Amino acid sequence: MKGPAFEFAVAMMKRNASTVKTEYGEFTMLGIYDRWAVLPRHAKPGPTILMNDQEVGVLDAKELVDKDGTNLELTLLKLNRNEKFRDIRGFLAREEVEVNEAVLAINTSKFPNMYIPVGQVTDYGFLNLGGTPTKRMLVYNFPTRAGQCGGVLMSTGKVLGIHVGGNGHQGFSAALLRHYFNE
């Protein structure tokens, strides 16, 4: 709910975020570097996606899992496009980070250009999400709404995670770690 978090959030969204539709829904999508971006796993991007209402080919998609095959609920995708994202890997943490004030940033047709102060972010860890064991979950409390998936969780100078579910007054992000984007 602090200014610097919002200021960082707005800068990051304006440069690296877009609105994406897959067969399964409409999502916020953050680009990370080069032609690599990130979606919630359940977006299940196909051979093409709609990115700001424009068809874009997908060159690679990687559904992330840890060293023991456990779901991390993130899909990294490489887009067939000429523009490059600003490289924002320097704003990713090396491990799960907790903060006292974060902002969740959404941009879809249902929630255009919206920012939500979500307060404290906890490293929750293990969660059974829909029946699938899942790790590196971050938790925060705010009045959730459907259609917020892919929203970007941030704090001053950090992209902490990608929103992957929520119900009632509880939201969860997959932690967005620096080593996911080595190479």
TrEMBL record:
Transmembrane regions: none
Residues at which Mg(2+) binds: E101
Domain Peptidase C3, chain residue ranges per copy: 3-181
Domain of life, source organism: Viruses
Cellular location(s): Host cytoplasmic vesicle membrane; Host nucleus; Virion
Subunit architecture: Capsid protein VP1: Interacts with capsid protein VP0, and capsid protein VP3 to form heterotrimeric protomers. Five protomers subsequently associate to form pentamers which serve as building blocks for the capsid. Interacts with capsid protein VP2, capsid protein VP3 and capsid protein VP4 following cleavage of capsid protein VP0.
Family, per entry: Belongs to the picornaviruses polyprotein family.
Described function: Protein 3A: Localizes the viral replication complex to the surface of membranous vesicles. It inhibits host cell endoplasmic reticulum-to-Golgi apparatus transport and causes the disassembly of the Golgi complex, possibly through GBF1 interaction. This would result in depletion of MHC, trail receptors and IFN receptors at the host cell surface. Capsid protein VP2: Forms an icosahedral capsid of pseudo T=3 symmetry with capsid proteins VP2 and VP3. The capsid is 300 Angstroms in diameter, composed of 60 copies of each capsid protein and enclosing the viral positive strand RNA genome.
Protein name: Genome polyprotein
Section of the entire sequence shown: 1556 to 1736 of 2200
